[PDB]
Design a protein around this ligand. Structure first.
Ligand SMILES: N[C@@]1(C(=O)O)C[C@]2(CCCN2)C[C@@H]1CCC[B-](O)(O)O
Ligand SMILES: N[C@@]1(C(=O)O)C[C@]2(CCCN2)C[C@@H]1CCC[B-](O)(O)O
Ligand SMILES: N[C@@]1(C(=O)O)C[C@]2(CCCN2)C[C@@H]1CCC[B-](O)(O)O
Ligand SMILES: [Mn+2]
Ligand SMILES: [Mn+2]
Ligand SMILES: [Mn+2]
Ligand SMILES: [Mn+2]
Ligand SMILES: [Mn+2]
Ligand SMILES: [Mn+2]
Lengths: 317, 317, 317
């Protein structure tokens, strides 16, 4: 089945943020048996291996923006790989790595399917421009480079001349927001992007949120869905091993409900599992817990339903 | 009050599954002072004691099904006792013990009240047949023996010839499902059984789940209700000392909500508190936490309300 | 802005309950940086300091009621200070201290705003009279001293002659109840007080809870809102360092949603943050967690929102 045909890309990249270890995410996710688990779920899985992100020594800051050439080239090379997987008729599964990789993942996906819609599960908007950013960390800026309405607000950052904005503000839905910068909130409200912060999830419940999200994106016509899952979107009681955790997050159940509903459209076309950092656990158990939650979210994107699953055979004979 | 008139039955049995300690469930529920708290809630409590389960020598397996004569006899004896409690105009309250005992608890209850409706709160469907099971543990098979629609699909298993299917596929509602086998999922679909998996609970909220459950069972007219409560239906964050824990379960709140709602109909007629295993706690507090929750669940079935409770007197004098 | 103009009053009082340490509540809330966080949030903050509560020796009990003269005096002192802050046109922010201080906090606030509506966030109703109490602890009795309907059911308690009931049964809404005494349950129902116990929060979701609360209080016309927050309204997993914790409480998210919805009315006029006991944390981490949660709650009352916030300027320039 189309919704269960997968091309796994390993993106071991960390220079979009300051904390070492996030590049180990593709290794830890594989070691937890992700590939084997997806095949037990009737998936056709092709593992495209881990992208080599050859060292870019001499990568001085652009103003306050850190490692711009490394971040730009990693995303540029990932875009090429995602385009190749999409051309092979497979759902691209990007194992991160930090969230700056979404620049390349979404650009590469939009090359084959320009009509795609984006569902962004995260505690943060990641919509800072290189000029509104106060941290200078590119993992909090991927969306700004991707939105068409922000063209003229993105300065000429070394390593990003290949970037052409591919998503319009009306083609993205945020879910799980709870730590937004002032500049980011200004962008969000001015561009009129559809969002469901933890306030909306509390108000409406996850059922109504997904109902509104899928109607908002697919109501006019059926189009490919790109899900970008930052593991910090869930509460740190489920994914503690991550760079920028924020309390009061989406529950484990809620994370599975979003992925269960997205799978059911049959239109998932690209998936990012980002920000798993196996060296940010306070104990060896916080690491396994983060990785198992990430694996569980992934399996639900490819058909695993809590109600159960069965093959078209007579189980009573 | 009929809704507060109880017949206590201890069922210290574990051979429906391979993990030792669940036979100690009645003792630890009793030690926590369940009977005293119920009497303190204005309940008429009669204690029928803990049933003696004689060891069956040479209890050879039926195919891969383990301890068939023991599970069969334990349920046969429990059926007789539940029928005796019901005939005395009391609500039977079975303290388990593994979930295989539900065969006898529900059969016994259907002998006095054949128009009963079953609410099954669990992470599991326990609807495997002796042939669909892959584990061979009978606690994952009680619903198959009880269902009228499965007559002809259950072979002659030693110890079960006394069983006559007493409930139809339309007289049972599941709440909490999140770990269902393919064959169980097939049965669920082909027999059109009403169920609220954790997916439906996330979608609708426990308020709507309970509205629909009671409307489904009581819609036509009032009829007796049997609640079979497996503690693993709740999240292992609340009930960890259990044999088959599954993450992302019902909350402590949702569990009380379900039981407070069933109490309010005044139609509770049979109750099972199952799968409490006090040898399966990682810490002594994990055991007390499980037992405290199971006691809190039982107290709400018999009137204890979070908004409060009071005697029909004038407290301002 | 008026909704951001604050008058801070520290109330280091503990004699309303038997557990030492709650008098250290205003200090640990200050040491966390509450005032500084409010100032950074564009809040006009004025520190009125901590009230000097003079030790009353030979404070003999009134029947069973412990420290009557000390509790009455402290609330009498707080009433004059809250009334002063209100006449200065600032929102009174009382840093508790045990919940008996609500006597003084609400009374002083009604002296300047007699048409005020109360939102009481608590696991408990705190509506016992000096005659219905079984503990004799005055922190579980403040609502009885304040209701006009209970005038004649409150005996002459030494230190409380200054009290004059300032609210009617229809001017108060409870949210989060789950441990109500029989005497209190009788009072709650006979007076027909509006309440949302955890059962209604589970049934409706916090979104409908806030919809109904605000509609009931502000329906007829706009009126000042007094929020008295007992940190034990939230589950012990978010606020463990407290004297009377009850399991199955409001989540961190619900706590934030209540306080965000209250800010949005622009009618917040009084705020009590009560029962933070830094000496009751099982570990130093349990203390910090409670204090951090209490700070998060307070900031949301004055405009800090999870979707983000921004100043009225063009951030894209
Ligand atoms: N908006 C921030 C930024 O640096 O631009 C500011 C920040 C630092 C303190 C407050 N939150 C992290 C966030 C970046 C998140 C990236 B990610 O984890 O979602 O991928
Ligand atoms: N379907 C199972 C079986 O053994 O038949 C397979 C199982 C083991 C691995 C997956 N779940 C346990 C379950 C049984 C639960 C019984 B009870 O705890 O809910 O009462
Ligand atoms: N109803 C009680 C009372 O003492 O009047 C009985 C009590 C003692 C054990 C059961 N709950 C505490 C509660 C008081 C709460 C005060 B507060 O924390 O909400 O402010
Ligand atoms: Mn992100
Ligand atoms: Mn993030
Ligand atoms: Mn079971
Ligand atoms: Mn179970
Ligand atoms: Mn209180
Ligand atoms: Mn309280």
């Amino acid at each position: 089945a189309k919704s269960r045909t997968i091309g796994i890309i390993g993106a071991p990249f960390s220079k979009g943020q300051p904390r070492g270890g996030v590049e180990e995410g593709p290794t830890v996710l594989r070691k937890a048996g992700l590939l084997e688990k997806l095949k037990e779920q009737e998936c056709d899985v092709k593992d495209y291996g881990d992208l080599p992100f050859a060292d870019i020594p001499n990568d001085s800051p652009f103003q306050i923006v850190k490692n711009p050439r490394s971040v730009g080239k990693a995303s540029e090379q990932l875009a090429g790989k995602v385009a190749e997987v999409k051309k092979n008729g497979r759902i691209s599964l990007v194992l991160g790595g930090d969230h700056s990789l979404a620049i390349g993942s979404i650009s590469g996906h939009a090359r084959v399917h320009p009509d795609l819609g984006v569902i962004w599960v995260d505690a943060h908007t990641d919509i800072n421009t290189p000029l509104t950013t106060t941290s200078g960390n590119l993992h909090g800026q991927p969306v700004s480079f991707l939105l068409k309405e922000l063209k003229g607000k993105i300065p000429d950052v070394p390593g990003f001349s290949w970037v052409t904005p591919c998503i319009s503000a009306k083609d993205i839905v945020y879910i799980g927001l709870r730590d937004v910068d002032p500049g980011e909130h200004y962008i969000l409200k001015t561009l009129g992007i559809k969002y469901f912060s933890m306030t909306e999830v509390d108000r409406l419940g996850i059922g109504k949120v997904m109902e509104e999200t899928l109607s908002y994106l697919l109501g006019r016509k059926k189009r490919p869905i790109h899900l970008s899952f930052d593991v910090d979107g869930l509460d740190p009681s489920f994914t503690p091993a991550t760079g920028t955790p924020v309390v009061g997050g989406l529950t484990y159940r809620e994370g599975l409900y979003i992925t269960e509903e997205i799978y059911k459209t049959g239109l998932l076309s690209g998936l990012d599992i980002m920000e798993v950092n196996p060296s940010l656990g306070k104990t060896p158990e916080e690491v396994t817990r983060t990785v198992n939650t990430a694996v569980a979210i992934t399996l639900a994107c490819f058909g695993l339903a809590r109600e159960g699953n069965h093959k078209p055979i007579d189980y009573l004979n």
